[PDB]
Amino acid sequence: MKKTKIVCTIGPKTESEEMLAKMLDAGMNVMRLNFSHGDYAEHGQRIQNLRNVMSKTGKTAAILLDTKGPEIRTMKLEGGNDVSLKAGQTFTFTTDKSVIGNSEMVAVTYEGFTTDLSVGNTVLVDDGLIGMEVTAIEGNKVICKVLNNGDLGENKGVNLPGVSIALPALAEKDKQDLIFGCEQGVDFVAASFIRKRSDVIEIREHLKAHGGENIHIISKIENQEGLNNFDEILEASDGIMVARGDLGVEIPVEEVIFAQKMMIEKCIRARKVVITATQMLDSMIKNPRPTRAEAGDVANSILDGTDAVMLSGESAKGKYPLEAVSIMATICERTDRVMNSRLERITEAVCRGAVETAEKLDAPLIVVATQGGKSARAVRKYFPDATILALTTNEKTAHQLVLSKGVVPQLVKEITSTDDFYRLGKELALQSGLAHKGDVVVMVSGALVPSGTTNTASVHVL
Template structure:
């Protein structure tokens, strides 16, 4: 038996909806809805502790975004004339309007509103929400519980692009420097995460437990400032596109392969790879289609696993026969144009 805090939550759940407890460590699925209670089956996890949060990724909760406690807290905050107020678990643009009405009815101070995006239905309506909010926070903690975690970076990019289009500031938040709660130095992955937020043109990065319970809050801020400052300098120095590289003559050949594939809307690039060089060069041009590397040695196929977009296969028969069609079919590509690279020869053929 688990006690959920709001009747509106209970009334919003339907059979088949998921209930996630303790940051998604426990998953339950609703199997029955009765007056005053929900019957659910535990799908994943075992022990349930008290005072843990819950998430409802499949449910549009029919309730006010402001709980009674929220209203009391906001009443007090308004007396301090804050610059910004952030709203948690926004689902729809009407949530922002409700909070704005609450504030403007109590003060003439120009308090701006940040909508925290941490629910799938908010992601689906991000343009509408950003249009009525004054700013957006990508709250990746709860968001990564409610959506597949591997989609969070792509969702973050989408939100940033939307906010830039609509002229709304956007904050990247959650675990930016999480290990610095107990460490004086961030991990390399955290350094890249903070820098990428700057490269993606996020307006701000945000700390949480790093500065609330961390061993060196000042050090956290100094570290983050160093990373974003350098990333900004780099973005200014390479203002066209930070991900592009200089078009040096050495890359003309591989760029022509990628351009041929792009201009002919090819389904794939097939490379007969005696070594890793040609395939790696084409991969570094970042074509948006698969690069199928047909190899005759295991070591070459294994090494090419590191390169973006490359699908290596070791097959002496396909390699010896230069069978690009069956190589493509092996990866589920059954139609369209193929750009075929065999040594210095580049050709375009149609797979039928």
């Protein structure tokens, strides 16, 4: 019933085949492997468990590897004791990795800390808990004024709002994780902390060098620089993950909502998948139902037009993973059902016209022939009322279309001509149970053209 797709982070509490089967039943479509945690054996077993469930059940799902990414962290403290920092005090960061910290100084993991920052910049420590102002930079030290009281622990994330950070596109561990991704045949790589087009290119070349040229890159937009370069990032990527939580400590709080809406809108126009993620139903880590605010947040992201919504801790380690997935699916179908098409060069003319024709003829189903998935994503751009049945001979395309809104992939032996596509599509339409005898279906394909163009629309009664 629902069209919006659900990404579920799988962890210890949901990794068993029993759980994965019930997760798919409840509406999960894509497994997220979060490589900030776990080791290759845990993630590898999760992949095995899912593909076994898919084989036994005939269910289709996609697998997304989400990188840890490069980051700036504080380091160790004296006797590993927390230190209490006070508004107004001076506090210093050093790039000397040998230093053990105290209430006056701590080391950071990033040698470029002194170069990238300027006097007057803001330094945020521990997911924005403690704010500081840079007052001087001397040698390997960044000297600051603490702006608010807070307890500093060990190895805390550092955020530098509005700063262009010269960290590499990939941490060394990320590069090995991507090779693991290629070994395992993952369908998507979600790359963290993408700031510019060149970051995306480096990831693409790394995957290409290990046989992952057909893996789709989902760039995570987490700070102002990525927002500034969004158009070029999107062009080089296959999709976008809107990381609202990270944006919330990196840009003015009133900008975050319009950053999400703008990024979703541009992804739609580019025919590229977008995932809304972080801080979705987090209260369900501890509670069996979400808050009103969370449900509204999720629903507005769907009304914005997102292809997919993502569960993190709620599904990986929380106490009510199945409840979280089920209420997410309820939110999806309740919100999708009240959304309308948006019908306002060749592919788009044909795909937009195909959706218009389907709407005017009350067709419940658009059947699309596709090799790389573009024709299905081109139809989805207009938010058809009809479900999209996407026929492909490409197993990776079949998996990847699971993430696109309102698309049902079906792997087929092959499609040998335009008329054979019509014959086969009509029977698979009936077999799918998505349409019935007497229903109108619209059938969209590329005839006598290279694989990337969609140029033909045809109307059939089942």
